[PDB]
């Protein structure tokens, strides 16, 4: 395996962040990459063995450490907006030799100005209108989670209490509907008769990730403890 931690982080500018990566494969090398929307998977720092850490394509701003053979940790001393990206750690074979690397889950890090911008989302269910297009249906149900920040959310669908994966069409990525607001929308298409069975339940649950236990909230307003939101509805008679 190749674990990662934290798996989501909201840090403020000027703060020092640290992301760890463990590797139960006994590999020599470890790599600290950062995938950026628009750009690709880029190499920041890597190491050929415990007690060595070479600069990769983009080292600037980051330090790294290979204190043990199992651990490699990328350090952000003066976290800035610029480091807002998704960090992938890879264990395994040699640099530039992807066929032998074992990637980690990925850490989503957003370095914002002030933590009072983190807002959980609103989630709603809608029905489109076939009459609006010449083509068919345009998706049975519409889940629209919006007005959230930062995008550390995972949308899901649950019919009759089970998470489905068939007929769902969640947007590839959250769209910044404003400088400090994100919009997301999945579309679950079912059989009309199914949507017309009043006994059938439909749940669009969005996972929000915000201020972690280690993040001290500035005294003055209630702190976003929120985790999992959802919009539900049932079948509308046929």
């Amino acid at each position: 395996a190749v674990t990662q931690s934290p798996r989501n982080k909201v840090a403020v500018t000027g703060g020092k962040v640290t992301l760890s990566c463990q590797q139960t494969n006994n590999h020599n090398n470890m790599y600290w990459y950062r995938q950026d929307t628009g750009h690709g998977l880029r190499l920041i720092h890597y190491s050929y063995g415990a007690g060595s850490t070479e600069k990769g394509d983009i080292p600037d701003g980051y330090k790294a450490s290979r204190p043990s053979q199992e651990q490699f940790s990328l350090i952000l001393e003066l976290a800035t907006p610029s480091q807002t990206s998704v960090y992938f750690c890879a264990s395994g074979g040699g640099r530039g030799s992807y066929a032998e690397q074992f990637f980690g889950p990925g850490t989503r890090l957003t370095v914002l100005e002030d933590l009072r911008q983190v807002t959980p989302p609103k989630v709603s269910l809608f029905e489109p209108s076939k009459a609006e297009i010449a083509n068919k249906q345009k998706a049975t149900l519409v889940c629209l989670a919006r007005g959230f920040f930062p995008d550390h959310v995972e949308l899901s669908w649950w019919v009759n209490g089970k998470e489905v994966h068939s007929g769902v069409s969640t947007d590839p990525q959250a769209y910044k509907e404003s400088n400090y607001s994100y919009c997301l929308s999945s579309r679950l298409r079912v059989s009309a008769t199914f949507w017309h069975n009043p006994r059938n339940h439909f749940r669009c649950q969005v996972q929000f990730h915000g201020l972690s236990e280690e993040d001290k909230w500035p005294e003055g307003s209630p702190k976003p403890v929120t985790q999992n939101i959802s919009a539900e509805a049932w079948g509308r008679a046929d």
Binding site: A134, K136, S191
Partner: protein
């Protein structure tokens, strides 16, 4: 005598589609499922029948699932020896409940309609009904052509596919990333004046849901090949 001709702003513009047009072309360029004297063998969801039809062209599948607008239509052909023709797809082709987004399996395909009874539907002396197709590029008849077929009662789909395939090669109706035409509707006109057209351009957006498009054939609309008139209409962004 049924569907009103398309208003200019009712039709799709290819320049409003910022995706890989070649996903539209995949459907038409020498791509289809063909069957003769095949019986339904299973059913996933009411309105859909499953047939044992192998991929003669490239051994990709051995099963085909055609969905019809209603169970009434499914139940109709359930035990009827038929013929099968139409463009099949893969992304979003599920036969079982335990199949997540993105057809993970292999050996099976999907489609809509394209069924016609086999009994006496084929020409008395083994002939091929020719269907004339007139082309209008920018309100000007530029070219015309015929499309053969061994059936008295074909599906508009079959003709539309066959119609378009021809154009992909001759007029480059769909390029891999774009198309020379801005719009294009294939008007169907039967003997009784009944008219029904279809839109060849992908709905404006940055995606092309092949399974969503192919539903234009969900009804299984069939037409008398020996008397039907087909008019392919096209337009170009300038003239």
């Amino acid at each position: 005598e049924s569907q009103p001709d398309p208003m200019p702003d009712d039709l799709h513009k290819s320049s409003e589609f910022t995706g890989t047009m070649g996903n539209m072309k995949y459907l038409y360029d020498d791509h289809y499922v063909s069957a003769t004297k095949v019986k339904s063998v299973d059913k996933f969801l009411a309105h859909d029948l499953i047939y044992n039809i192998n991929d003669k062209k490239l051994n990709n599948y051995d099963k085909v699932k055609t969905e019809l607008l209603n169970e009434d239509l499914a139940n109709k052909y359930k035990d009827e020896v038929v013929d099968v023709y139409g463009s099949n797809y893969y992304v979003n082709c599920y036969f079982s409940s335990k199949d997540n987004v993105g057809k993970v399996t292999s050996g099976k395909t999907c489609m809509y309609g394209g069924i016609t009874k086999h009994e006496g539907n084929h020409f008395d002396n083994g002939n091929l009904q020719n269907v004339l197709i007139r082309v209008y590029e920018n309100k000007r008849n530029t070219i015309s052509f015929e499309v053969q077929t061994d059936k008295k009662s074909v599906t508009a789909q079959e003709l539309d596919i066959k119609a378009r395939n021809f154009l992909i090669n001759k007029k480059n109706l769909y390029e891999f990333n774009s198309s020379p035409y801005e719009t294009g509707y294939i008007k169907f006109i039967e003997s009784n004046g009944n008219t029904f057209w279809y839109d060849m351009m992908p709905a404006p957006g940055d995606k092309f849901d092949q399974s969503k498009y192919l539903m234009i054939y969900k009804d299984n609309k069939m037409v008398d090949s020996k008397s039907v008139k087909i008019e392919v209409h096209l337009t170009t962004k300038n003239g």
